Write an enzyme that holds these catalytic residues in place. Structure first.
Site, PDB file in Angstrom:
ATOM      1  N   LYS A  14      -3.348  -7.622   7.089  1.00  0.00           N
ATOM      2  CA  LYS A  14      -4.202  -8.031   5.973  1.00  0.00           C
ATOM      3  C   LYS A  14      -3.602  -7.494   4.679  1.00  0.00           C
ATOM      4  O   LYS A  14      -3.977  -6.412   4.206  1.00  0.00           O
ATOM      5  CB  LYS A  14      -5.638  -7.541   6.166  1.00  0.00           C
ATOM      6  CG  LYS A  14      -6.409  -8.276   7.279  1.00  0.00           C
ATOM      7  CD  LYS A  14      -6.617  -7.410   8.532  1.00  0.00           C
ATOM      8  CE  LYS A  14      -7.453  -8.134   9.600  1.00  0.00           C
ATOM      9  NZ  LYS A  14      -6.961  -7.919  11.008  1.00  0.00           N
ATOM     10  N   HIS A  17      -2.855  -6.974  -2.694  1.00  0.00           N
ATOM     11  CA  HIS A  17      -2.461  -7.927  -3.728  1.00  0.00           C
ATOM     12  C   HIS A  17      -0.957  -7.875  -3.981  1.00  0.00           C
ATOM     13  O   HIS A  17      -0.320  -8.919  -4.160  1.00  0.00           O
ATOM     14  CB  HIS A  17      -3.247  -7.684  -5.022  1.00  0.00           C
ATOM     15  CG  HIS A  17      -3.002  -6.349  -5.659  1.00  0.00           C
ATOM     16  ND1 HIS A  17      -3.491  -5.169  -5.138  1.00  0.00           N
ATOM     17  CD2 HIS A  17      -2.351  -6.014  -6.800  1.00  0.00           C
ATOM     18  CE1 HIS A  17      -3.135  -4.163  -5.920  1.00  0.00           C
ATOM     19  NE2 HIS A  17      -2.443  -4.648  -6.936  1.00  0.00           N
ATOM     20  N   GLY A  39       2.689   0.148   0.351  1.00  0.00           N
ATOM     21  CA  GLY A  39       2.787  -0.841   1.405  1.00  0.00           C
ATOM     22  C   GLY A  39       4.148  -1.491   1.538  1.00  0.00           C
ATOM     23  O   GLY A  39       4.257  -2.528   2.205  1.00  0.00           O
ATOM     24  N   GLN A  96      17.440  -2.350  21.964  1.00  0.00           N
ATOM     25  CA  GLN A  96      18.392  -1.256  22.148  1.00  0.00           C
ATOM     26  C   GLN A  96      18.019  -0.215  21.100  1.00  0.00           C
ATOM     27  O   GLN A  96      18.548  -0.234  19.985  1.00  0.00           O
ATOM     28  CB  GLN A  96      19.822  -1.747  22.005  1.00  0.00           C
ATOM     29  CG  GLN A  96      20.178  -2.850  22.984  1.00  0.00           C
ATOM     30  CD  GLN A  96      21.498  -3.512  22.662  1.00  0.00           C
ATOM     31  OE1 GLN A  96      22.169  -3.142  21.701  1.00  0.00           O
ATOM     32  NE2 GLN A  96      21.879  -4.499  23.466  1.00  0.00           N
ATOM     33  N   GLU A 147      14.326   2.047   0.078  1.00  0.00           N
ATOM     34  CA  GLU A 147      14.738   3.061  -0.899  1.00  0.00           C
ATOM     35  C   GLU A 147      16.092   2.702  -1.507  1.00  0.00           C
ATOM     36  O   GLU A 147      17.037   3.501  -1.558  1.00  0.00           O
ATOM     37  CB  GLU A 147      14.743   4.456  -0.280  1.00  0.00           C
ATOM     38  CG  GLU A 147      13.369   5.135  -0.353  1.00  0.00           C
ATOM     39  CD  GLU A 147      12.842   5.232  -1.789  1.00  0.00           C
ATOM     40  OE1 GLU A 147      13.435   5.972  -2.606  1.00  0.00           O
ATOM     41  OE2 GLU A 147      11.854   4.540  -2.108  1.00  0.00           O
TER      42      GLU A 147
HETATM   43  N1  LIG Z   1      -1.897  -4.351   4.075  1.00  0.00           N
HETATM   44  C1  LIG Z   1      -2.051  -3.134   4.602  1.00  0.00           C
HETATM   45  N2  LIG Z   1      -3.192  -2.812   5.242  1.00  0.00           N
HETATM   46  C2  LIG Z   1      -3.412  -1.597   5.770  1.00  0.00           C
HETATM   47  N3  LIG Z   1      -2.499  -0.615   5.712  1.00  0.00           N
HETATM   48  C3  LIG Z   1      -1.293  -0.787   5.113  1.00  0.00           C
HETATM   49  C4  LIG Z   1      -1.003  -2.089   4.517  1.00  0.00           C
HETATM   50  N4  LIG Z   1       0.221  -1.984   4.005  1.00  0.00           N
HETATM   51  C5  LIG Z   1       0.673  -0.742   4.255  1.00  0.00           C
HETATM   52  N5  LIG Z   1      -0.218  -0.020   4.915  1.00  0.00           N
HETATM   53  C6  LIG Z   1      -0.063   1.394   5.357  1.00  0.00           C
HETATM   54  O1  LIG Z   1       0.877   2.146   4.583  1.00  0.00           O
HETATM   55  C7  LIG Z   1       2.045   2.409   5.365  1.00  0.00           C
HETATM   56  C8  LIG Z   1       3.117   1.312   5.244  1.00  0.00           C
HETATM   57  O2  LIG Z   1       3.842   1.237   4.015  1.00  0.00           O
HETATM   58  P1  LIG Z   1       4.107   2.494   3.124  1.00  0.00           P
HETATM   59  O3  LIG Z   1       5.322   3.211   3.512  1.00  0.00           O
HETATM   60  O4  LIG Z   1       2.872   3.288   2.953  1.00  0.00           O
HETATM   61  O5  LIG Z   1       4.130   1.966   1.666  1.00  0.00           O
HETATM   62  P2  LIG Z   1       5.352   2.402   0.816  1.00  0.00           P
HETATM   63  O6  LIG Z   1       6.489   1.946   1.635  1.00  0.00           O
HETATM   64  O7  LIG Z   1       5.172   1.561  -0.420  1.00  0.00           O
HETATM   65  O8  LIG Z   1       5.305   3.878   0.787  1.00  0.00           O
HETATM   66  C9  LIG Z   1       1.464   2.537   6.731  1.00  0.00           C
HETATM   67  O9  LIG Z   1       0.808   3.799   6.779  1.00  0.00           O
HETATM   68  C10 LIG Z   1       0.459   1.440   6.779  1.00  0.00           C
HETATM   69  O10 LIG Z   1      -0.533   1.760   7.733  1.00  0.00           O
END
Ligand SMILES: Nc1ncnc2c1ncn2[C@@H]1O[C@H](COP(=O)(O)OP(=O)(O)O)[C@@H](O)[C@H]1O
Ligand SMILES: [Mg+2]
Length: 252
Positions: A14, A17, A39, A96, A147
């Protein structure tokens, strides 16, 4: 070519934005300058999963500064691909873990049926910038740079971009910013959001049509955490705060 709401629903995904904006973009060069917790990893993993199933035979890499960093997105792609394969009976996943190599074999009929013939194999690999030796090949349809601002430009210019241009593949270039380096330049090529603090030359910058850029501080994605982020400035250097959470481009 773009994952759909129906595909997201299959993934149990889900998007927020900013993630949604990345997914809706058709640009061949997507550059996301986002703070921690934005995210980035999840959205990139969803993009890779979609390619492997929706484009049989597609080949892609996720490249990070280190293997431990590349394992993050790679591991999330693995979980999603191994789960999603359940609902595509004509696929079979081969992993792998040691070599960070994920294969999605596509067949001419359901894998459990007699006579199943393999028709195509999608491939996704994790790669490390601190191991240039293992950067050989390959005809990529897509690449994720995680990164990216910490990856030397030479990895992009010499080892990634040439192979992409062959198959007109796309790149998702994601990072917290690390000053005015190549990632800043690529960001500006796609930045159409106008003047914004923390982005030198925003508002007056030119753009390239194949570039689209996305920007968000950690508190743009997590507004309820804004005060906590701000209160960390008591013990976090100002530059680290502006970069890692503000997603600001600062002249070191
Ligand atoms: N659409 C989303 N819904 C719920 N949780 C998310 C979503 N996108 C990312 N996350 C959460 O954040 C992490 C994934 O990306 P993240 O590394 O946090 O963001 P960034 O890479 O920008 O630091 C995971 O902990 C994931 O559970
Ligand atoms: Mg990340």
């Amino acid at each position: 070519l773009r994952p759909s709401d129906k595909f997201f629903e299959l993934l149990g995904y889900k998007p927020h934005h900013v993630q949604l904006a990345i997914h809706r973009s058709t640009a061949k060069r997507r550059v996301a300058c986002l703070g921690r917790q934005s995210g980035k990893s999840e959205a990139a993993s969803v993009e890779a999963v979609f390619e492997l199933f929706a484009r049989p035979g597609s080949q892609g890499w996720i490249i990070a500064p280190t293997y431990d960093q590349a394992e993050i997105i790679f591991g999330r792609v693995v979980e999603k691909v191994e789960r999603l394969a359940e609902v595509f009976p004509a696929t079979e996943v081969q992993l792998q873990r040691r070599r960070l190599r994920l294969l999605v074999h596509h067949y001419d009929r359901p894998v459990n049926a007699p006579g199943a013939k393999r028709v195509a194999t999608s491939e996704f690999r994790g790669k490390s910038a601190d191991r240039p030796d293992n950067l050989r090949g390959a005809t990529l349809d897509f690449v994720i740079l995680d990164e990216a601002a910490m990856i030397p430009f030479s990895v992009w210019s010499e080892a990634i971009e040439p192979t992409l241009s062959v198959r007109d593949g796309w790149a998702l270039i994601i990072s917290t910013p690390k000053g005015l380096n190549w990632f800043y330049e690529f960001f500006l090529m796609g930045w159409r959001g106008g003047l914004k603090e923390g982005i030198p030359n925003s508002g007056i910058n030119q753009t390239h049509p194949d570039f689209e850029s996305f920007h968000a501080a950690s508190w743009d994605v997590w507004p309820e955490r804004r005060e906590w982020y701000m209160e960390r400035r008591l013990y976090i250097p100002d530059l680290e705060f502006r970069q890692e959470y503000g997603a600001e481009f600062v002249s070191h």
